[PDB]
A paper describes a structure:
Orthologs of LURE1 in Torenia concolor (TcCRP1)15 and A. thaliana (AtLURE1)9 were recently shown as key attractant molecules, indicating a significant role played by these secreted proteins in pollen tube guidance. By contrast, our data showed that the LRR-RK PRK6 expressed at the tip of pollen tube is an essential receptor of the same attractant peptide and important for targeting of pollen tube to ovule in the pistil. In the current study, we present biochemical, structural and functional evidence showing that AtPRK6 functioned as a receptor of AtLURE1, strongly supporting previous genetic data.
In order to probe the recognition mechanism of AtLURE1 peptides by AtPRK6 at atomic level, we solved the crystal structures of the AtLURE1.2-AtPRK6LRR complex crystallized in two different forms by molecular replacement. The AtLURE1.2-AtPRK6LRR protein complexes in the two crystal forms display a nearly identical structure. The N-terminal segment (residues 20–52) of AtLURE1.2 is completely disordered, whereas its C-terminal portion (residues 53–89) adopts a typical structure of plant defensin peptides characterized by cysteine-stabilized αβ-motif (CSαβ). The C-terminal loop of AtPRK6LRR is mainly responsible for its interaction with AtLURE1.2. The loop of AtPRK6LRR binds to a positively charged groove diagonally across one side of AtLURE1.2, whereas the C-terminal extension of the last LRR packs against the outer side of the antiparallel β-sheet of AtLURE1.2. AtPRK6LRR-AtLURE1.2 interactions are both shape-complementary and charge-complementary, resulting in a total burial surface of ~1226 Å2. Interaction between AtLURE1.2 and AtPRK6LRR is mediated by a combination of polar and hydrophobic contacts. Arg83 of AtLURE1.2 is located at the center of the AtLURE1.2-AtPRK6LRR interface by being sandwiched between the C-terminal loop and C-terminal extension of the last LRR of AtPRK6LRR, forming hydrogen bonds with the carboxyl oxygen atoms of Tyr227 and Cys237 of AtPRK6LRR. An extensive network of polar interactions is formed between Asp234 of AtPRK6LRR and its neighboring residues Arg73, Ile86, and Ser87 from AtLURE1.2, suggesting that this AtPRK6 residue has an important role in recognition of AtLURE1.2.
Numbering used by the authors:
A (entry chain C): 13 to 51
B (entry chain B): 26 to 240
Write the structure that this text describes.
Amino acid sequence: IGRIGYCFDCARACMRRGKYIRTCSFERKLCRCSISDIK
Amino acid sequence: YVSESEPLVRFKNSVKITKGDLNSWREGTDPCSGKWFGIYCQKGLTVSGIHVTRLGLSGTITVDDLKDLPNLKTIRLDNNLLSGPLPHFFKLRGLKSLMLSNNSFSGEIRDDFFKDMSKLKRLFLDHNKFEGSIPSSITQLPQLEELHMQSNNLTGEIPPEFGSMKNLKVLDLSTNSLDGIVPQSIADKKNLAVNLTENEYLCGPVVDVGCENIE
């Protein structure tokens, strides 16, 4: 497991929803994306 | 007016100055002479503003004396070393502008603190050490145009009442730890300049953040 690794996976998770990454923390297992779609 | 020298002089003794001084606040002289450091007067007749900036005022302050200045409309105590919770500003009923930027005022401001301050137009509480929630009475200020509370230790949700503030044009709550979801009313509001950045856990309409954790 890893922290920065987690945010990259968050980034990808967000990208496969057409959204930008917004919020990421490994300790809280929270990855949040934007509401808006990529421009 | 000379009579207005009495409350100011009392106020001068109720604070600890550690840089410069207020020796130009001489009891029995009209504070509107032009000789008083930091005094603004309306039409050069009656004291309407007090500006005691960068004097290293430290410890607790009391402002009660200032209620005897009928035309006092602005106070600026920016850039000092004030700490403790807010003094009795609410006794200064005609106050239009209150500036406390860059001090160490602390605690959670009691929700009803501002109820008696219906004339406030500008409120700067930024760069202090306020914690807990935004007091609900701030949202009830019918004349408020600007609120700056950036750089404190604030938490909890942002009250939706902000969206229904007729005169509000500037709302800076950045770099706190405000929480939960942003009320839609706030995003809806017409020509409002808002800044909610550096509140990590905020989600919703203005910060542009889906609330759902996708992990």
